């Protein structure tokens, strides 16, 4: 059974109001490929130009052909641990997610709680005439390599709803995961190297407030030792085991 998914599950079942914050590593197993390597992806693109608001209105093509060859899983589908990270919100213990990811799994997964730290991909808008559009509208044609254009304007500058180099966070959003972080009762990472602001500090305050701290990672991580459990391993193998530790002491 392992102590660690014991304890996680034992802290959960005990609590009343449950934050989940999760990174890359939570949809690794969805078929989207984590952060690994981004030092030398700026040896390949000037990050400036393909992924900054600036270069952005310089020329919307680098953006768009820049994603064209690093994207890869256009249609993933949420793993077992986002669906774990649902079921233990329909339970009365999850009260929120706070993610840094722009793939949208939580919800598809039935999480009605979602604070986007970097935006999201669900909504496009065209810089000129301001028609918005949902990414489904561009899906097909982006993979078969095409850049997506206004259809009522004709514009290029179709800009996704996404956090690039040169803009602010999302302060609103900030604010409420900030918050969250600081009345919850229990706290847990899942998939996140909380080496960079906000995610490297949202576990500081929660653990100032006196959050149980949980963190279910792959690999560690500098934070680790504030955290009352910390588990080394797959998300989507982990998390429904926990869930249904919980179920089990429920149920008993
Ligand atoms: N400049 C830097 O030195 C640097 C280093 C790391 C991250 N960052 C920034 O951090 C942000 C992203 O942070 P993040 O934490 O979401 O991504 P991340 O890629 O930094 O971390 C993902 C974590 O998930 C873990 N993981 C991988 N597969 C897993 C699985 N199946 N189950 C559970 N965990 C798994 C990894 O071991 C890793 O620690 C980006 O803005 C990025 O640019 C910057
Ligand atoms: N899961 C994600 O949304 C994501 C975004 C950018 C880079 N790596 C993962
Ligand atoms: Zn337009
Ligand atoms: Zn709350």
Redesign the pocket.
């Known amino acids: 059974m392992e102590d660690e998914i014991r304890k996680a599950a034992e802290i959960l079942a005990k609590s009343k109001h449950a934050v989940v914050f999760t990174?890359?590593?939570?949809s690794?197993?969805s078929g989207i490929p984590?952060?690994?390597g981004?030092?030398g992806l700026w040896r390949k693109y000037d990050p400036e130009e393909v992924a900054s608001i600036s270069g952005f209105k310089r020329n919307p093509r680098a953006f768009w052909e820049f994603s064209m060859e690093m994207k890869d899983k256009l249609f993933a589908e949420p793993n077992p641990?986002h669906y774990a990270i649902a079921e233990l919100e329909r339970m009365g213990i999850v009260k929120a997610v706070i993610t840094?990811?722009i793939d949208m799994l939580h919800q598809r997964a039935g999480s009605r709680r979602v604070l986007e730290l970097?935006g999201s991909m669900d909504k496009l808008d065209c810089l000129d005439c301001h028609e918005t559009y949902d990414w489904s509208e561009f899906v097909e044609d982006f993979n078969k390599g095409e850049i997506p254009r206004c259809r009522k304007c004709g514009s290029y500058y179709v800009k996704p709803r996404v956090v690039l180099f040169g803009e602010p966070l999302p302060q609103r959003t900030l604010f409420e995961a900030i918050e969250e972080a600081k009345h919850c009762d229990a706290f847990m990472v899942?998939?996140?190297?909380?080496?960079?602001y906000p995610?490297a500090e949202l576990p500081y305050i929660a653990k100032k407030a006196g959050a149980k701290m949980i963190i279910?990672?792959?690999?560690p991580?500098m934070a680790d030792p504030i955290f009352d459990v910390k588990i080394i391993?797959?998300?989507?193998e982990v998390l429904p085991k926990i869930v249904e530790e919980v179920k089990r002491l429920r149920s008993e």
Request: net charge negative; no cysteine.
């Open positions: 990174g890359a590593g939570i690794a197993e984590t952060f690994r981004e030092d641990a840094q990811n970097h899942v998939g996140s190297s909380l080496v960079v995610a279910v990672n792959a690999e991580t391993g797959k998300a989507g």
